[PDB]
């Protein structure tokens, strides 16, 4: 099984973004 999660980053230099990512367990 693989794990995945999203984080909050400045996609517009100062906005709310939901960039999802996956990694091995």
Method: NMR
Stated length of the chain: 25
Whether the Cβ atoms of residue 2 and residue 24 lie closer than 8 Å to each other: yes
Give the total number of structural domains in the chain: 1
- What b/e string do you get for 1-25 counting C-beta neighbours within 10 Å, with b at 16 or more? eeeeeeeeeeeeeeeeeeeeeeeee
Residue 21, C-beta contacts closer than 8 angstroms, at least 6 positions apart = 4, 5, 6, 7
Q: Domain limits at 9?
A: 1-25
Residue 5's φ and ψ, nearest 5 degrees, are -155, 160
Q: Is 17 helix (H, G, I), strand (E, B) or coil?
A: coil
Q: How many helices (H) and strands (E) does the chain have?
A: 0, 2
Whether the Cβ atoms of residue 21 and residue 7 lie closer than 8 Å to each other: yes
What is the C-alpha R_g of the chain?
11
Take residue 12 and report the two structure tokens written for it. Answer: 């517009």
């Amino acid at each position: 099984i693989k794990s995945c999660e999203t984080f909050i980053v400045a996609c517009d230099g100062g906005k709310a973004c939901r960039e999802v990512k996956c990694k091995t367990i």
